[PDB]
From a paper:
PLs selectively target glycans composed of uronic acids with a C4 hydroxyl group linked to the preceding sugar in the glycan chain. This enables PLs to operate through a β-elimination mechanism that relies on proton abstraction from the C5 carbon of the uronic acid sugar ring, resulting in double bond formation between C4 and C5 and elimination of the preceding sugar. The three characterized PL33_1 enzymes were all from Bacteroides species inhabiting the human colon: BT4410 (BtPL33HA) and [name] ([name]) are hyaluronidases from Bacteroides thetaiotaomicron VPI-5482 (B. theta) and [name] (B. cell), respectively, while HMPREF1181_01744 (BsPL33Heparosan) is a heparosanase from Bacteroides stercoris CC31F (B. stercoris). The enzymes are 68% identical and contain a larger N-terminal α-helical (α/α)6 toroid domain (residues 21 to 401; BtPL33HA numbering used throughout this section unless specified) and a smaller β-sheet C-terminal domain (residues 402 to 635).
The C-terminal domain possesses an extended loop region between β-strands 5 and 6 (Leu455-Leu484: BtPL33HA, and Ile464-Leu493: [name]), forming an octahedral Zn2+ coordination site [supported by anomalous X-ray diffraction data], along with the loop region between α-helices 12 and 13 from the N-terminal domain. The two domains oppose each other in such a way that a deep, open-ended cleft is formed resembling an active site that would be compatible with an endo-processive mode of action of BtPL33HA and [name]. Analysis using the Consurf server, which maps residue conservation from a sequence alignment to the structure, demonstrated a high level of amino acid conservation within the cleft, consistent with it housing the active site residues. Analysis of the five enzymes via SEC-coupled light scattering and SAXS indicated that the three PL33_1 enzymes BtPL33HA, [name], and BsPL33Heparosan are dimeric, while the PL33_2 enzymes ObPL33CS and ObPL33Gellan are monomeric. SAXS data indicate that the dimeric enzymes all bind as head-to-head homodimers, generating elongated envelopes. This is consistent with PISA analysis of the crystal structures of BtPL33HA and [name] which predicted a buried surface area of ~1,388 Å2 and 1,006 Å2, and a complex significance score of 0.207 and 0.290, respectively. The phenol of Y470 moves within 5 to 6 Å of the +1 GlcA and N-acetyl of the −1 GlcNAc, while F475 moves within 5 Å of the +2 GlcNAc, forming the tunnel topography. This differs significantly from the wide-open cleft observed in the crystal structures of both BtPL33HA and [name].
Numbering used by the authors: 26 to 642
């Protein structure tokens, strides 16, 4: 945590903010509903696909979300029973809105009215799992209280746009529709935001040890759209926009300055990506007077999604994250354009893989509309993903290294209480021509143990199944104070090392253990350099991999995967075995196939001090 307060410094004060604010929704960057020519020019060939999406919803049947659909969360923790009809309802509305903007003949208005009307009858827009933050802590929506969550924020931003575009059309049919929708938005977004200081995601009660995360910018971004679209009293608007700036500053203050996403690439789009959206929304709402887009840290927070991307759908997957990824190109484009990152824009074009971008349907109206606005520029942008020799994130302690023969090495220092922590201090992952060769297993299906204190009985979470030693046969231990020390990165030598001794418990009986990586033009060198207090058990050095693994030759492990070969050479003191790891969990088997392997290298004798050297070529 660092007291940057970038937003508050950029605006100066509420009073200065109030003068910057753009009233009467003149900041809106889309064409008027009645500007058919404008919508045609902007949509191009997307027009037709949006209209056919609306035709599907012409006969959409609104679903009651049952009381028992909420009660289930309490009974059993099941959430899909509630989420599935809720999302269907919400997506129907968003697609009817996009279809009506594209066609503009009033043919979707009746169902828009139905969706708005139904939406005002629903007790709550909040997800069943998030309703336990009511006073009473019940999962059943309590008509006497309001809460704001991820779900209700999106639902509010969508209905605010529905109001903005269509209130005049609704009024021709019956003024009560608009009138009530406006009153509902006031009751469910606008008032609770201002009147309740204690929502955890707002972080006005934050103290060291408490989390701030994606919720903060995500919730705030939605709140801000609602205020900019509905609040036509300048004093009330400035007060609310100022509070959102103070809240989001909490998130910007908490993040690491090197710009790495600790949640990882799978979460980037809703963490730094929703911050970006919040900042777009605030910029447009202040005629660009309030902007952080020239700030390097905001740029680096964006480029992380480029640097973690290895190729052909593989991403760096430290912690409990998927090895597969390849994010929202339209999003990545817009972030890149805003911060002047050519890297980000080229990469968005690269993710399209020679295909035309699409307007997303989904439940995020801001992103649907912004994809309509900027997709045409994305479609013309020249594609590339040029990955530098070294990327070094010194606070987060991620290091990505690359050579000209198509090798990508990811390594980390860090600590064993990271987001979605794995016990993996000093681990590496190696890819050759985008093919994973020494691998990090990543995310499995959630069970009762996952978020319990039996978590580290799950093999994917254990240093045992990462590319690490078991020192005196002991793995790393969970905890904030199990960390790398003496962390070094020398970009010019493609070098990283960390004293990983301090990520092991006392039972490891280790004084120091330096794990070091040196990527040459055609090889990787790994070294382990250690002093133990007692030589109790043979050290065991483990490598995770897949494909065909051949340990027949002593001193050498050949790995063949998808026509890529590497050879791992190890010292004579070790004996090699290869253990099969079957993958019943399809969340893993969909990624790696039905089985992967652990290469176990067990030192023939215990030693007090020693140096192991591994070469992969
Ligand atoms: Zn892992």
């Amino acid at each position: 945590y660092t007291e940057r307060n970038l937003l508050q410094k950029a605006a100066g004060s509420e009073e200065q903010l109030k003068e910057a604010l753009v009233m009467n929704q003149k900041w809106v960057p889309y064409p008027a509903y009645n500007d058919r020519a404008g919508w045609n020019e902007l949509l191009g060939t997307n027009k037709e696909s949006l209209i056919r999406a609306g035709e599907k919803m012409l006969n959409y049947e609104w679903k009651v979300i049952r009381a028992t659909d909420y009660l289930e969360y309490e009974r059993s923790g099941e959430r899909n029973i509630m989420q599935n009809p809720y999302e269907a309802n919400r997506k129907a509305i968003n697609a009817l809105m996009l279809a009506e903007l594209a066609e503009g003949k009033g043919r979707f208005i009746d169902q828009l009215i139905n969706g708005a009307f139904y939406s005002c009858e629903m007790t709550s827009w909040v997800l069943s799992a998030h309703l336990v933050r009511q006073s009473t802590k019940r999962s059943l929506p309590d008509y006497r209280e309001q809460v704001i969550d991820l779900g209700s924020g999106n639902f509010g931003s969508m209905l605010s746009w529905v109001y903005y575009f269509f209130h005049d059309s609704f009024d021709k049919i019956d003024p009560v529709i608009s009138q009530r929708l406006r009153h509902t938005l006031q009751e469910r977004i606008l008032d609770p935001y201002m009147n309740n200081d204690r929502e955890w995601w707002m972080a006005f009660q934050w103290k060291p040890g408490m989390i701030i995360n994606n919720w903060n910018p995500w919730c705030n971004s939605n709140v801000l759209q609602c205020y900019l679209l509905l609040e036509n009293d300048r004093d009330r608007l400035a007060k609310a926009v100022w509070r959102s700036m103070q809240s989001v500053d909490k998130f910007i203050n908490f993040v690491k300055a090197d710009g790495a996403c600790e949640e990882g690439p799978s979460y980037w789009g809703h963490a730094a990506g929703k911050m970006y959206d919040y900042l777009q929304i605030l910029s447009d709402g202040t005629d660009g007077k309030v902007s952080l887009f020239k700030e390097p840290m905001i740029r680096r927070m964006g480029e992380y999604i480029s640097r973690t991307y290895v190729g052909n759908g593989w991403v760096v997957n430290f912690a409990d994250a998927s090895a597969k990824g390849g994010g929202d190109a339209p999003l990545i484009y817009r972030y890149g354009r805003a911060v002047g990152s050519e890297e980000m824009m080229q990469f968005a074009a690269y993710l399209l893989d020679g295909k035309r971008p699409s307007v997303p349907l989904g439940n995020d109206t801001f992103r649907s509309l912004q994809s309509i606005l900027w997709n045409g520029e994305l479609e013309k942008t020249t594609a590339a993903h040029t990955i530098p020799a070294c990327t070094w994130y010194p606070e987060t302690e991620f290091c990505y290294l690359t050579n000209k023969s198509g090798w990508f090495l990811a390594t980390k220092g860090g600590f064993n209480n990271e987001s979605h922590n794995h016990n993996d201090v000093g681990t590496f992952s190696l890819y050759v021509n985008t093919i994973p060769v020494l691998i990090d297993a990543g995310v499995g299906t959630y069970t009762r143990q996952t978020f319990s204190s039996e978590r580290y009985t799950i093999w994917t979470m254990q240093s045992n199944y990462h590319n690490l030693p078991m020192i005196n046969g002991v793995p790393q231990s969970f905890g904030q104070n199990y960390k790398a020390t003496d962390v070094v990165c020398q970009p010019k030598k493609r070098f990283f090392s960390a004293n990983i001794a301090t990520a092991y418990p006392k039972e490891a009986e280790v004084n120091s253990w330096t794990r070091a990586y040196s990527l040459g033009d055609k090889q990787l060198t790994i070294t382990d350099n250690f002093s133990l207090k007692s030589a109790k058990e043979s050290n065991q050095v483990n490598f995770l991999t897949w494909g065909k693994v051949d340990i027949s030759v002593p001193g050498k492990v050949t790995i063949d995967v998808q026509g890529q070969k590497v050879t791992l050479e190890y010292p004579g003191e070790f004996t090699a075995t290869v253990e099969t790891i079957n993958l019943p969990d399809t969340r893993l088997s969909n990624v790696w196939g039905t089985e992967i392997y652990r290469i176990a290298l067990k030192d023939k004798d215990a030693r007090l001090t020693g140096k192991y050297k591994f070469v992969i070529k």
